[PDB]
Enzyme design. Structure first.
Site, PDB file in Angstrom:
ATOM      1  N   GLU A 117     -79.789   6.477 -28.696  1.00  0.00           N
ATOM      2  CA  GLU A 117     -78.732   6.298 -27.660  1.00  0.00           C
ATOM      3  C   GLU A 117     -78.083   4.917 -27.805  1.00  0.00           C
ATOM      4  OE1 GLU A 117     -79.757   6.321 -23.506  1.00  0.00           O
ATOM      5  OE2 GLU A 117     -77.705   6.804 -22.879  1.00  0.00           O
ATOM      6  N   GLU A 154     -76.398  11.766 -15.849  1.00  0.00           N
ATOM      7  CA  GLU A 154     -77.236  10.570 -15.595  1.00  0.00           C
ATOM      8  C   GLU A 154     -76.543   9.745 -14.514  1.00  0.00           C
ATOM      9  OE1 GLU A 154     -77.654   7.693 -18.825  1.00  0.00           O
ATOM     10  OE2 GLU A 154     -79.739   7.388 -18.261  1.00  0.00           O
TER      11      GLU A 154
HETATM   12 MN   LIG Z   1     -77.873   7.271 -20.914  1.00  0.00          MN
END
Ligand SMILES: [Mn+2]
Ligand SMILES: [Mn+2]
EC number: 5.1.3.31
Lengths: 286, 286
Positions: free
Chosen positions: B151, B245
């Site tokens: 990520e 998220e």
């Molecule tokens: Mn994230």
């Protein structure tokens, strides 16, 4: 409140990582060359600046100055440690004195807390200590015809106020006529519900503006909705300092640049960056 | 590569700040209630998960699980300290083991460094140490039919990779068939030159997506150009996990929340947030 005018400034770190005699000449010549009305001097250590030399440089290049700074852990006015608050008061008075000495009228930036990544949220005592410190600073500034503008910054740089709306609430607790909100498109890009809401709410309370791209590189190469932001300034007919702010590994201040996590090189040509920045701004506001 | 499909998930911190019996159920029930295909478990300490209870909860609520984590200073695989890198290797294999026991297929997030603010830029040794760690993780994960997705996060959270382009280069060095790029619109909103470039560049190398608003609050109340991003995903016909998220002071994981500087309350009603998010996403991509 002391007089504010629509004027265009460049942040020192567009040109210079330090404020040595050379560094000062380079930045001041830089800003004047690009056609800026003023330079914004970074005063993280307000004792290391040769004020007389800087004043001569401003005369020489017919350029005005305002000052920004961020406090450190040692000078954090939010601290529940009275000694650390006193060090902060002392640094902000010195910064005010230097700014007065250079014929400046705006002390802005993260002047109300340690600039950086807090390990946890702010207690009410942290906020209360902050409000009381900006009252003492506002009262000291007022004797020297200086306005203070509290810069709302993102969550990684302050735990006190991350949005214009939070800043306006804090300001109403400060309750000083020469204390204003300072907005920065870079920080707004992260925290704000669109680029207009905080500017419209501020109105005359908005006393200083930072223009920064989402990644803090070239204006127009990021995600910042400048069309939105400049529309909002027009709606409140904003007339105050607008400084271009940018950070590349190309020009690094040992402390500020690592504090601001400037890991990549978004530019190399200070003059190209600064020249293009002022063009971009004046095309969309003036 | 282990099988990927277009599936919608929610991050655990949308519902729950811990993974106790009660917190696990609350997050899984929350995801199931909103109509998510999977829960994304935050595994910053993979030893604390009751794997049997969680397995029973996923069965009970007919939900799949993927796992995300950030390393800490104690487990930083970029460290020049070989003992700290070994701690990193150990944690990432425990995370893998946990995911495997849950019948999981994706270990994603900041698995390649200590999640948070670095005091300075990453050396080549820091990055070399990272690549080698991700190679060892990838080979371990492959034996358990688990893909790893790297990520890319903003400057304040890593000094290794801040744009998709940088993430893809890191990823090519790792050179493993089950290693992929993980993009997150929140981090992209800060660092990226628009919301399309990294996605078009990634194509089949994009393995995992996070949907976060500019301020990590309600989708469509921030600055993120979602229309651009979802147009880019469509171009490359992305068929992988898409996780909503979000962080509010309303639901605190004592570690993660403070590391992510979640000072502000951007929502109180998890179910309203999560439900509106999924609808927002499925409206623009399905
Ligand atoms: Mn994230
Ligand atoms: Mn600024």
């Amino acid at each position: 409140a002391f007089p504010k005018r629509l004027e265009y400034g460049g942040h020192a770190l567009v040109w210079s990582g330090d404020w040595s005699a050379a560094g000062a000449r380079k930045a001041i010549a830089g800003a004047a060359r690009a056609g800026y009305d003023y330079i914004e001097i970074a005063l993280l250590d307000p004792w290391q600046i040769d004020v007389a030399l800087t004043k001569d440089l401003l005369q020489e290049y017919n350029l005005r100055a305002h000052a920004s700074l961020g406090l450190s852990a040692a000078t954090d006015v939010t601290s529940t440690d009275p000694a650390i608050v006193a060090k902060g008061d002392e640094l902000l008075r010195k910064a005010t004195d230097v700014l007065y000495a250079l014929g400046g009228s705006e002390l802005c930036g993260v002047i109300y807390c340690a600039l950086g990544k807090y390990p946890g949220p702010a207690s009410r005592e942290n906020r209360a200590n902050s409000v009381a410190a900006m009252q003492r600073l506002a009262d000291y500034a007022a004797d020297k015809g200086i306005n203070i503008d509290l810069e709302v910054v993102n969550r990684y740089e302050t735990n006190i106020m991350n949005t214009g709306l939070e800043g306006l609430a804090f300001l109403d607790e400060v309750n000083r006529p020469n204390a204003f909100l300072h907005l920065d498109t870079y920080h707004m890009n992260i925290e704000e519900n669109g680029m207009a809401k905080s500017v419209l709410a501020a109105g005359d309370r908005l006393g200083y503006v930072h223009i920064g791209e989402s990644h803090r590189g070239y204006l127009g190469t990021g995600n910042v909705d400048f069309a939105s932001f400049f529309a909002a300034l027009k709606q409140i007919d904003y007339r105050g300092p607008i400084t271009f702010e940018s950070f590349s590994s190309e020009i690094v201040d040992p402390k500020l640049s690592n504090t601001l996590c400037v890991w990549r090189n978004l530019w190399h040509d200070s003059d190209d960056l600064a020249g293009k920045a002022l063009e971009f701004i004046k095309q969309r506001y003036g």
